[PDB]
């Protein structure tokens, strides 16, 4: 293996959930996105970004309604243009190895549109609308947002903190979808 | 005037459902259409008539519903899915846009209570979430959803959801972490 030194490869294992082999597989995926831009030796610590247009078109992000903000959040400078470090960080968090609470941390970050460390009613409405992808009517979405805030607003301040969000049943399905004819 | 029902019958159906008299008439014809040789055009004599489940579950409105069998059982007179007109109208009433959230949740509790013991246990919950998430959540993911739901919503700490527990849940909220699990 000639892409990385031992130091930097151990550093990637230290700061991700991946094995050395998985890091190498992900590197060659990253390099494959822009083979004439991304170098094949990172021992010199090159400063290289793959444009967002190539990140958002990956099969793992194509059909994600939040692909733009995921890429923004993990990109070095918030524009979705990703270094190798950014790319490995994103896929580490998205991996099956990442714990629920870590995924919820970054989910909270992408749903906090105005970056004020709260999910407000407008952030929540925007988020539920994008996630349900037309399954819910606008009137149903508002009902969802009202009860979520009723149940989960710990500080009774009209918005969700990270703590409120992590304490929610974040993945439970729509148990009432089956009652609309 | 129509000749299927008496004035009193149609007034009573309007009183006990969310439907208008004209809507009741349209739904009767839908029911009668399922089996015209079985369902009479005269209900003024209060006929005892059931449409077999096989014709209920194959309705355009129910055939794609993963819980169509439980829905028919819960609304059927005797719990076997063979439905009278009254059962049929009650089912459509609860499933209509007019029915409030809490009413749908009341009947959702009944269909997901697979053994009709008035509680949703861990098995009921696993079966329900599994059916609602086929192809979306793995068996392992279904298990962790069920574990949290019970942890957060089991008010009596008996390992089961009461109707009150179920009503208080965020029953229709989407999967907020789908964006961080890859398909
Ligand atoms: Ca915010
Ligand atoms: Ca039960
Ligand atoms: Cl290893
Ligand atoms: Cl596209
Ligand atoms: Cl998770
Ligand atoms: Cl009318
Ligand atoms: Cl009409
Ligand atoms: Cl099915
Ligand atoms: Cl509803």
UniProtKB/Swiss-Prot annotation, chain B:
EF-hand domain boundaries: 63-98, 100-135, 141-176
Subunit architecture: Monomer and homodimer. Interacts with ITGA2B (via C-terminus cytoplasmic tail region); the interaction is stabilized/increased in a calcium and magnesium-dependent manner. Interacts with TMC1.
Note: The binding of either calcium or magnesium significantly increases the structural stability of the protein in comparison to apo-CIB (calcium- and magnesium-free form).
Domain of life: Eukaryota
Residues the entry annotates as binding Ca(2+) 1: 113, 115, 117, 119, 124
This protein's UniProt keywords: Calcium, Magnesium, Metal-binding, Repeat
Database matches in Pfam families: EF-hand_7
Keyword Cytoplasm: no
MF GO annotations: calcium ion binding; magnesium ion binding
InterPro entries, A to Z: CIBP, EF-hand-dom_pair, EF_Hand_1_Ca_BS, EF_hand_dom
Keyword match Lipoprotein: no
Binding site for Ca(2+) 2: 154, 156, 158, 160, 165
Native source species: Homo sapiens
Lineage, highest ranks first: Eukaryota, Metazoa, Chordata, Craniata, Vertebrata
Entry function: Acts a an auxiliary subunit of the sensory mechanoelectrical transduction (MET) channel in hair cells. Plays a role in regulating hair cell MET channel localization and function.
Identification of the protein by name: Calcium and integrin-binding family member 3
